[PDB]
Design a protein around this ligand. Structure first.
Ligand SMILES: CCNC(=O)Nc1cn(-c2ccccn2)c2cc(-c3cccnc3)cnc12
Ligand SMILES: [Mg+2]
Length: 192
């Protein structure tokens, strides 16, 4: 019943996306970023993370990284599925992404899963080792949903990242634009 209730949730989000993110215009596209960054901010307010990085990659992929505990990977009681899977299959940003990847650094291990329109493409896998902890999410907004534009505006992202760092003192938040490999722009904010 749990996996079924996942699938229906994905269908609900993709059918009426503006009811979930306000709009499917440029404002809604940027809201994707905010939803991811807010969870990293919670991890910092919980006392675990202090660095967040937002990268505009080639072809308008977004990469968000935090140095928190890593979204958990233990098998759930209620879903029979890894915890990270449960959280990402319940995610609006994942449902509204043509593709999304997660890498978790936790338990000295790197775990990876990829999704399309919220649907896992394979079971969570151990891909490497690490001596760090944290979460990386990389997603590509679905152009079937975001029919006006899938191009992010650096200044929009910059303004709000600066605000978030000034509000959440102590967290280092970095924005980087790598869309033109010949001219990479970075702003990094860290108050008090
Ligand atoms: C790059 C975007 N990064 C994230 O989304 N980071 C997190 C979201 N979540 C999260 C968890 C639940 C619901 C929604 N989001 C977390 C939970 C934990 C966590 C909690 C308890 C023990 N160990 C780790 C740690 N990082 C996260
Ligand atoms: Mg949220």
């Amino acid at each position: 019943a749990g996996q079924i209730q996942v699938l229906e949730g994905l269908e609900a989000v993709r059918k009426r996306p503006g009811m979930y993110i306000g709009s499917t215009s440029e404002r809604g596209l940027h809201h994707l970023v905010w939803e991811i960054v807010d969870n990293s901010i919670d991890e910092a307010l919980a006392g675990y993370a202090n660095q967040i990085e937002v990268v505009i990659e080639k072809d308008n992929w977004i990469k968000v990284t935090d140095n928190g505990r890593g979204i958990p990977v233990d098998i759930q009681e209620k879903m029979g599925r890894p915890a990270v899977e449960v959280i990402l299959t319940s995610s609006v940003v994942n449902a509204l992404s043509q593709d999304l990847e997660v890498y978790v650094h936790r338990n000295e291990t790197i775990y990876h899963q990829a999704y399309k329109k919220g649907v896992p493409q394979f079971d969570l896998k151990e891909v490497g080792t690490t001596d760090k902890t944290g979460t990386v999410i990389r997603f590509k907004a679905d152009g079937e949903i975001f029919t006006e534009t899938t191009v992010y505006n650096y200044e929009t992202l910059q303004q709000r990242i600066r605000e978030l760092a000034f509000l959440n003192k102590g967290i280092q938040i970095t924005l980087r634009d790598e869309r033109d490999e010949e001219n990479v722009r970075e702003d990094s904010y860290h108050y008090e």
